[PDB]
Coordinates of C-alpha atoms and ligand atoms in Angstrom, one line a residue:
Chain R
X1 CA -29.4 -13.3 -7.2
X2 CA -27.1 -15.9 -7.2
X3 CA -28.9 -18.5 -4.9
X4 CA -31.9 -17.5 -6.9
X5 CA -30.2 -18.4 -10.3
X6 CA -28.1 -21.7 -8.8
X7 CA -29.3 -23.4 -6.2
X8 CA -32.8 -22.7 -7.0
X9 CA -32.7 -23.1 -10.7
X10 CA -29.5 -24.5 -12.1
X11 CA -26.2 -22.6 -13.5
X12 CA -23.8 -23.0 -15.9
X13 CA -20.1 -22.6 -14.9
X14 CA -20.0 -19.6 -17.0
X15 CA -23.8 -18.2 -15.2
X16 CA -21.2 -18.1 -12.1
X17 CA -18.2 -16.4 -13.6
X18 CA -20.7 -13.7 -13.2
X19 CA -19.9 -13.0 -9.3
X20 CA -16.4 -12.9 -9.8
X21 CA -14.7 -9.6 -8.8
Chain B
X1 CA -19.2 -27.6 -19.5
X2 CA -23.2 -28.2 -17.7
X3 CA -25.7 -26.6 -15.5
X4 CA -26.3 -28.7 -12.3
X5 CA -28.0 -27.0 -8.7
X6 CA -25.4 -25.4 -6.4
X7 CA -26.8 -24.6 -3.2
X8 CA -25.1 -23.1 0.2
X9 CA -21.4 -24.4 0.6
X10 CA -21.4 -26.2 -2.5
X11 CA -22.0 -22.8 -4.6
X12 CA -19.1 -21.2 -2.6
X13 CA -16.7 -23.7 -3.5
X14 CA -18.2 -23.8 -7.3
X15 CA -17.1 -19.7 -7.1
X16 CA -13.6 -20.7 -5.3
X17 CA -13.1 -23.0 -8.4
X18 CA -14.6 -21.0 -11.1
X19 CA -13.3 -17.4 -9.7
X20 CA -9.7 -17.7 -8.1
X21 CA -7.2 -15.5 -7.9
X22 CA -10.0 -12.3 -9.1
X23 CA -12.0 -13.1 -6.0
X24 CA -15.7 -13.8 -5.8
X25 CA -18.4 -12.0 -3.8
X26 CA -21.6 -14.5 -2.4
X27 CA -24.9 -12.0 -1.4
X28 CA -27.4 -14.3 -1.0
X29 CA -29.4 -11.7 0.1
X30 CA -29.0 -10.3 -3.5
Chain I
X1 CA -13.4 -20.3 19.3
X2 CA -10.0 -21.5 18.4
X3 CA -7.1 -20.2 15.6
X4 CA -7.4 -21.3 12.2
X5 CA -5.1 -22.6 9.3
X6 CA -6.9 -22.4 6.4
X7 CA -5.9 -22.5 2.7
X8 CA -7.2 -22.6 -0.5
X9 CA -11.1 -23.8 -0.5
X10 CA -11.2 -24.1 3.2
X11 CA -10.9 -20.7 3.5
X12 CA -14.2 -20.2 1.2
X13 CA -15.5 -22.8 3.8
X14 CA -15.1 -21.4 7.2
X15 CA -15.7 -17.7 5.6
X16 CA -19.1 -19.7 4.5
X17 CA -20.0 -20.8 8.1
X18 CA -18.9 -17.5 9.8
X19 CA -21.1 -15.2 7.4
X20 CA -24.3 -17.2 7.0
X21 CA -26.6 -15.5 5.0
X22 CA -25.0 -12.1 5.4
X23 CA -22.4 -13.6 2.6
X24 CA -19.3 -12.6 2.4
X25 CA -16.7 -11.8 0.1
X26 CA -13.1 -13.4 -1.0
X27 CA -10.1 -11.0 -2.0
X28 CA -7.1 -13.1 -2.2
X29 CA -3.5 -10.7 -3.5
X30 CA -3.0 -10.7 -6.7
Chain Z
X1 CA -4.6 -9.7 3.2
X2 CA -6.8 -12.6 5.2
X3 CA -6.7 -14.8 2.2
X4 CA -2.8 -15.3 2.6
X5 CA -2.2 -14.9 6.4
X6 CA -4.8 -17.3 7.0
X7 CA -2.4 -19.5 5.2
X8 CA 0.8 -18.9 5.5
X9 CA 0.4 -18.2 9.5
X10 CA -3.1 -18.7 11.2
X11 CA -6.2 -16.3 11.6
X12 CA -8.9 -16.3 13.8
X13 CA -12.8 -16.4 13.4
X14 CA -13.3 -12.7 14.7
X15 CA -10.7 -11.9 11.7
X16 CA -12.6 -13.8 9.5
X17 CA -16.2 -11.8 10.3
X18 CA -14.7 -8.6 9.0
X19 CA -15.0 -10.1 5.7
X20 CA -19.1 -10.2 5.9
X21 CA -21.2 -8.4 4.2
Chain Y
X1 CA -21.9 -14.5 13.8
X2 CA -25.2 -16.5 12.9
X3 CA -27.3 -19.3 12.8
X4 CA -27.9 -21.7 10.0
X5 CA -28.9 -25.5 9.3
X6 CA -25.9 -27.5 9.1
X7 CA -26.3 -31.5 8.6
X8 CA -24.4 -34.6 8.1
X9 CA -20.6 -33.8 7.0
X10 CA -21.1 -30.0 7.0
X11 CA -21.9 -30.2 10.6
X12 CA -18.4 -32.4 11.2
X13 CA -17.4 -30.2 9.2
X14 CA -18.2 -27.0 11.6
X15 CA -17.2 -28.8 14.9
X16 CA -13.9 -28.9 13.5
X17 CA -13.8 -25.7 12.9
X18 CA -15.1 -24.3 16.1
X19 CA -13.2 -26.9 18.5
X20 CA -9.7 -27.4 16.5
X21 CA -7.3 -28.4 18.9
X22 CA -9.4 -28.9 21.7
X23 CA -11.8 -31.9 19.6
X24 CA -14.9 -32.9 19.4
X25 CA -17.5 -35.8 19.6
X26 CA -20.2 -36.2 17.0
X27 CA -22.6 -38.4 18.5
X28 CA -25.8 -38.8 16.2
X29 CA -27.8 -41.0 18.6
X30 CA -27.3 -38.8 21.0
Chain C
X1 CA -28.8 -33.9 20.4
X2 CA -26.2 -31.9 18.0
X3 CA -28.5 -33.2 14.7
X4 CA -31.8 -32.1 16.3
X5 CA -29.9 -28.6 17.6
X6 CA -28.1 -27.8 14.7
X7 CA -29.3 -29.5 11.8
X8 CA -33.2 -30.4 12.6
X9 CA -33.3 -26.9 13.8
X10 CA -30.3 -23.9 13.5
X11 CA -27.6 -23.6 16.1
X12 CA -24.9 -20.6 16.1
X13 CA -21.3 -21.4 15.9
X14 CA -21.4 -20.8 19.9
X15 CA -23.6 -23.6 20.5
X16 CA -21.6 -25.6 18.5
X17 CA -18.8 -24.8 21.0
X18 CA -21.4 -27.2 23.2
X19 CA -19.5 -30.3 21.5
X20 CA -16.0 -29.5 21.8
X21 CA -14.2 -31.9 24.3
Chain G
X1 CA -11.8 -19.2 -15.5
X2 CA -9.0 -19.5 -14.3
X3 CA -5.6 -22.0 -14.1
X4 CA -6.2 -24.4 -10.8
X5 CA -4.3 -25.9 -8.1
X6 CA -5.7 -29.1 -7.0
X7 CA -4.7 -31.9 -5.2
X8 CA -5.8 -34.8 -3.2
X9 CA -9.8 -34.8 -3.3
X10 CA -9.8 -31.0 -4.5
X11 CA -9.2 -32.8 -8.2
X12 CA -12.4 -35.1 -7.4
X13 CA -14.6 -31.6 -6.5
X14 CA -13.6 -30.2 -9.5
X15 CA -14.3 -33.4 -12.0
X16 CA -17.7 -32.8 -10.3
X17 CA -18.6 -29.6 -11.3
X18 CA -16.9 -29.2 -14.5
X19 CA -18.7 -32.9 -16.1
X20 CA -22.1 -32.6 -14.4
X21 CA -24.1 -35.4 -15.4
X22 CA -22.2 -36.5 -17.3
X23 CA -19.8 -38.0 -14.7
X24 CA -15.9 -38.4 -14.8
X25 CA -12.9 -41.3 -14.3
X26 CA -10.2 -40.7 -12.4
X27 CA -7.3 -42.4 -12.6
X28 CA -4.2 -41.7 -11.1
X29 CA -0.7 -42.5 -11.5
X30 CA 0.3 -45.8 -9.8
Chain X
X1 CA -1.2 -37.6 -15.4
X2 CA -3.9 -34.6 -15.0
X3 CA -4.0 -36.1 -11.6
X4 CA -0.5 -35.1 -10.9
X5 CA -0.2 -32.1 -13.3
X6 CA -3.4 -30.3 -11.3
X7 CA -1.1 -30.6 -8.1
X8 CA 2.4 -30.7 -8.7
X9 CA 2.1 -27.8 -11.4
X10 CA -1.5 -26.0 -12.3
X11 CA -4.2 -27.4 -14.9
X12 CA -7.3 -25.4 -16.3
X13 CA -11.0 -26.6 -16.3
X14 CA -10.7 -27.1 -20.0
X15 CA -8.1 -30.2 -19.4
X16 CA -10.4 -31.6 -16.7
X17 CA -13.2 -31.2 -19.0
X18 CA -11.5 -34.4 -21.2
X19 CA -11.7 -37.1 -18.0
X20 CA -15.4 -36.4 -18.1
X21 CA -17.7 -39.1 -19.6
Chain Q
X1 CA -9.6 -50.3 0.8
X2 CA -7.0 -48.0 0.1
X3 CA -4.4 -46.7 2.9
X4 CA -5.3 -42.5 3.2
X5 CA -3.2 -39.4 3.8
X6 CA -5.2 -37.5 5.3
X7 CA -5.1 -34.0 7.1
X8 CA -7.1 -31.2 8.8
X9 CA -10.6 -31.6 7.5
X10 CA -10.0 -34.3 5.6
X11 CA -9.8 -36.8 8.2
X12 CA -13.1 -35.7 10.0
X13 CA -14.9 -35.8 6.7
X14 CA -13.0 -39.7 6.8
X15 CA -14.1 -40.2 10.3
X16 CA -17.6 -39.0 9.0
X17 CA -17.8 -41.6 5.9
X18 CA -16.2 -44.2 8.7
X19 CA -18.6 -44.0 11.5
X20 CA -21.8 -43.4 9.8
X21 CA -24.6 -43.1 12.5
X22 CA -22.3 -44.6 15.2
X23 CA -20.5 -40.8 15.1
X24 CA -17.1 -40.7 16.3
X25 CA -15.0 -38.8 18.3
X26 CA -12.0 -36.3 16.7
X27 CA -9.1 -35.5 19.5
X28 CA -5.7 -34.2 18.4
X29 CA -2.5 -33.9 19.8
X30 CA -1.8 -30.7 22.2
Chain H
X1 CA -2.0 -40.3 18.0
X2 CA -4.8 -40.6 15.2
X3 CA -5.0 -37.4 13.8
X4 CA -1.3 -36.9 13.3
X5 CA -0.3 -40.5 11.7
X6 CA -3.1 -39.6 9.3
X7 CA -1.4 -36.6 8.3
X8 CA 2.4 -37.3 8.8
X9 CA 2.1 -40.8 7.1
X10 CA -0.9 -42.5 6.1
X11 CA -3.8 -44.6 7.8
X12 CA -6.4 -47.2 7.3
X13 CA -10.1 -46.9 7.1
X14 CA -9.3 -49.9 9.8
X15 CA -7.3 -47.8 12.4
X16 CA -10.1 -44.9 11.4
X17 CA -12.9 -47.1 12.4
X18 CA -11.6 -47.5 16.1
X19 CA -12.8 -43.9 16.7
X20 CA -16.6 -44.3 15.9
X21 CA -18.5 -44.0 18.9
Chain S
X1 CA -18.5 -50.0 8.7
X2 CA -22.1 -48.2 7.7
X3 CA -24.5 -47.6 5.2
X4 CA -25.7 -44.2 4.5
X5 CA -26.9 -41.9 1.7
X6 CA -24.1 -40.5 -0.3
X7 CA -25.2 -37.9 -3.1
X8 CA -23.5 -35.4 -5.8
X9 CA -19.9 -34.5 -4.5
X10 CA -20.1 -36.4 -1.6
X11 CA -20.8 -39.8 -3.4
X12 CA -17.5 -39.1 -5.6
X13 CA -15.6 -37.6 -1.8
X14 CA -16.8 -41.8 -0.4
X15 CA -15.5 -42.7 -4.4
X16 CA -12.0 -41.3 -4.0
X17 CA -11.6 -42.2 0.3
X18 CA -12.5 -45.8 -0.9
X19 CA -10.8 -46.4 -4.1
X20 CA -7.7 -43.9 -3.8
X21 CA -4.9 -44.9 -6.1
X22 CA -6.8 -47.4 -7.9
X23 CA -9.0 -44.6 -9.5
X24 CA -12.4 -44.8 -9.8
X25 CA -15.4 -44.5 -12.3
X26 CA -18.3 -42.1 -11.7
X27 CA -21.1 -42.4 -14.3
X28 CA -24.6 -41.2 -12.8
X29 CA -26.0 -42.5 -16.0
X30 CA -25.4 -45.6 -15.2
Chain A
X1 CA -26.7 -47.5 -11.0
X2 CA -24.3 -46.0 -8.3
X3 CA -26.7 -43.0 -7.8
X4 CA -29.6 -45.2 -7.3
X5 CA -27.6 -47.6 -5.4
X6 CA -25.7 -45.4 -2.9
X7 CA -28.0 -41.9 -2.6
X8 CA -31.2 -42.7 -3.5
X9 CA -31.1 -45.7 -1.9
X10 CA -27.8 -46.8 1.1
X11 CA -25.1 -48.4 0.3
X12 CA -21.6 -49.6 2.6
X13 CA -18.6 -48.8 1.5
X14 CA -17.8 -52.2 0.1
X15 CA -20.4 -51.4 -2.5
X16 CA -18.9 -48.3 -3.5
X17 CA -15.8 -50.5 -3.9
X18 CA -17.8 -51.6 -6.9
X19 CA -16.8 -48.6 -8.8
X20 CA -13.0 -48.4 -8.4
X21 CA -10.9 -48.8 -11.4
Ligands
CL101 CL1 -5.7 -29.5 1.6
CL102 CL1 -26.2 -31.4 0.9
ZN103 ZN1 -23.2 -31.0 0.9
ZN104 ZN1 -7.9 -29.7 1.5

């Protein structure tokens, strides 16, 4: 999940638009 | 923009920022 | 535990410290 | 909702735990 | 609510959210 | 102290209440 | 994303994630 | 300046993307 | 150094950068 | 006191310093 | 005042307490 | 530079004075 794909590894701004609502 | 590691409060603000007015949901649990 | 005036980010904050790794999720209006 | 009363007035922890998953 | 690891300016960060109006003293050493 | 109770180890938001004047 | 509202060291968090590694200035008026 | 602009009015992440190095 | 304006948690993450080790002690008014 | 000055009008990293422990 | 380690967004958070109005340059490239 | 001096390493707040404008 997101801590997974970001904190983890590493994310791209756009990567975290993907938890938006 | 880039890729850096966002971890615990630091991703939640990086959501705040990149999110706003839609709203974000953090599951860290998955 | 005492009332809160929280805006913006600092919201995302203290909704970060109260839900741990449950996570939580932000809904502002609109 | 809790994202503007917590901001225009003042909100409390316990209101804030509703918003857990 | 729950527990988690919180260090340096998070924790300051936490006190001030718990204690608000009453205060707080970080005190490192102790 | 708080760094050994909260961040050496975890602490709930309760115990944290510990260092409230 | 989404249009911001940032002020004070809200602006500095933001330079942070949007340049990375790259890095930032800030400059302010006056 | 975007300094101003971001908090007397609004400013997207694509204008703060030009004070980056 | 620069003269601040600082509020809410802004001036206990000051405080923090401040105090360093030594910790510090946050009381408001009321 | 502290804590209000900050806020109302400004504050030094000087007048800061005299609340470290 | 102290010496501690300041990394990511809380090196440019000490940037923008201790330069302020003057601005500031943060280039982790060196 | 300031990464090396101030998180890998310590550094006062003097030194990060170094990197105002
Ligand atoms: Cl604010
Ligand atoms: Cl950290
Ligand atoms: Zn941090
Ligand atoms: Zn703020």
């Amino acid at each position: 999940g997101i801590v997974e794909q970001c904190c983890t590894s590493i994310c791209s701004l756009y990567q975290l638009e993907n938890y938006c609502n | 923009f880039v890729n850096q590691h966002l971890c615990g409060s630091h991703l939640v603000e990086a959501l705040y920022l990149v999110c706003g007015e839609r709203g974000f949901f953090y599951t860290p649990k998955t």
